[PDB]
Design a protein around this ligand. Structure first.
Ligand SMILES: CCCCCCCCCCCCCCCCCC(=O)OC[C@H](COP(=O)([O-])OCC(O)COP(=O)([O-])OC[C@@H](COC(=O)CCCCCCCCCCCCCCCCC)OC(=O)CCCCCCCCCCCCCCCCC)OC(=O)CCCCCCCCCCCCCCCCC
Ligand code: SF4
Lengths: 226, 55
């Protein structure tokens, strides 16, 4: 079934428009580039806190450092300023500076990096950028974009929005981060579509990757808003 | 309490026991009838994480 109940092949434009080159050259051309399974070429959309944010066709299984150095002149403030990177896209969790170095953007390597290839829409936050604030617009963006049919997504992201609003402000207790963990996994795999799961991965990745920083901001709220 | 010494040594002797040590009625030994506000405790399930009622 599909549109008006008809068979309909939904293919991403990048996969559609690369299909020429694999029919004009063959599978050897596509498979030679990129790692096992993850092969070919994809538009890596370097942006965020990068010196020269642009969209470049790029090989996958590419180290992050030369991804931003060669094609963009580096990350603003260097790697030390770089606190984390969202390499794949929104549905791909961010990973810390101690992990980025030269992780390869091949689907398997993001999986071991607890993230995904997404659409290679890689964006960077510097140290000056608060990671709690960095995804603050991201998580509320997911809430602003949800059809709301299934209960986990309709009641999830908005509830996640409010509980994190007091998180970035710091009006919460240390247990509240654990509750945010619990309901994030609760909506995971329980929504009709992948928007909820797509919204789950960003917040899910942040919790298990910069948890002490999340616990850092809250007593900062407590000392002055006592 | 009220009762003078003369009545006292009569009631101690007739009973043979020191009744003035503790009385069968209270003059001033009770809690003040109104009490300062309390603060009730919490229990094993007033948590937000791994308290799923199923287990
Ligand atoms: C028979 C024994 C002799 C006469 C009574 C003696 C007596 O009562 O002594 C006081 C007293 C009374 O008993 P208590 O338990 O010691 O009383 C403690 C307080 O007085 C407790 O306080 P209270 O009750 O004495 O304070 C108030 C009280 C005040 O009471 C008194 O002052 C007692 C004296 C009578 C009044 O008055 C009232 O209660 C008003 C009502 C009075 C009722 C009617 C009394 C009639 C007396 C006899 C009339 C003629 C028959 O007893 C003693 O001091 C020793 C024993 C009696 C010795 C008498 C001499 C030998
Ligand atoms: S997860 Fe998808 S299907 Fe479910 S409510 Fe959100 S947008 Fe709708």
């Amino acid at each position: 079934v599909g549109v008006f109940g008809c068979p309909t092949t939904v293919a991403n434009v990048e996969t559609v428009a690369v299909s020429p080159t694999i029919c004009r050259r063959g599978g050897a051309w596509f498979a030679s580039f990129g790692r096992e399974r993850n092969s070919g070429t994809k538009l890596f959309n370097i942006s965020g806190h990068v010196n020269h944010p642009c969209t470049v066709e790029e090989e996958m299984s590419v180290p992050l450092k030369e991804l931003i150095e060669k094609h963009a002149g580096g990350v603003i403030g260097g790697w030390d300023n770089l606190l984390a990177v969202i390499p794949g896209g929104s549905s791909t969790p961010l990973i810390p500076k101690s992990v980025c170095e030269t992780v390869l953007m091949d689907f398997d390597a993001l999986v071991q990096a607890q993230t995904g290839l997404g659409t290679a829409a890689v964006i960077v936050m510097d140290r000056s950028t608060d990671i709690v604030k960095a995804i603050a617009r991201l998580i509320e963006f997911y809430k602003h974009e949800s059809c709301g049919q299934c209960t986990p997504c309709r009641e999830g992201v908005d509830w996640m929005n409010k509980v994190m609003a007091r998180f970035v402000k710091g009006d919460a207790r240390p247990a509240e981060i654990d509750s945010l963990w619990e309901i994030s996994k609760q909506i995971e795999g329980h929504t009709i579509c992948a928007l909820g799961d797509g919204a789950a991965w960003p917040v899910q990745g942040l919790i298990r990757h910069f948890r002490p920083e999340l616990e850092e901001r809250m007593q900062q709220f407590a000392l002055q808003h006592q | 309490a009220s009762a003078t010494r003369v009545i006292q040594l009569l009631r101690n002797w007739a009973s043979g026991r020191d009744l003035q040590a503790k009385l069968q009625l209270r003059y001033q030994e009770i809690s003040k009838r109104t009490q300062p506000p309390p603060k009730l405790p919490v229990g094993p399930s007033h948590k937000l994480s791994n308290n799923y009622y199923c287990t």
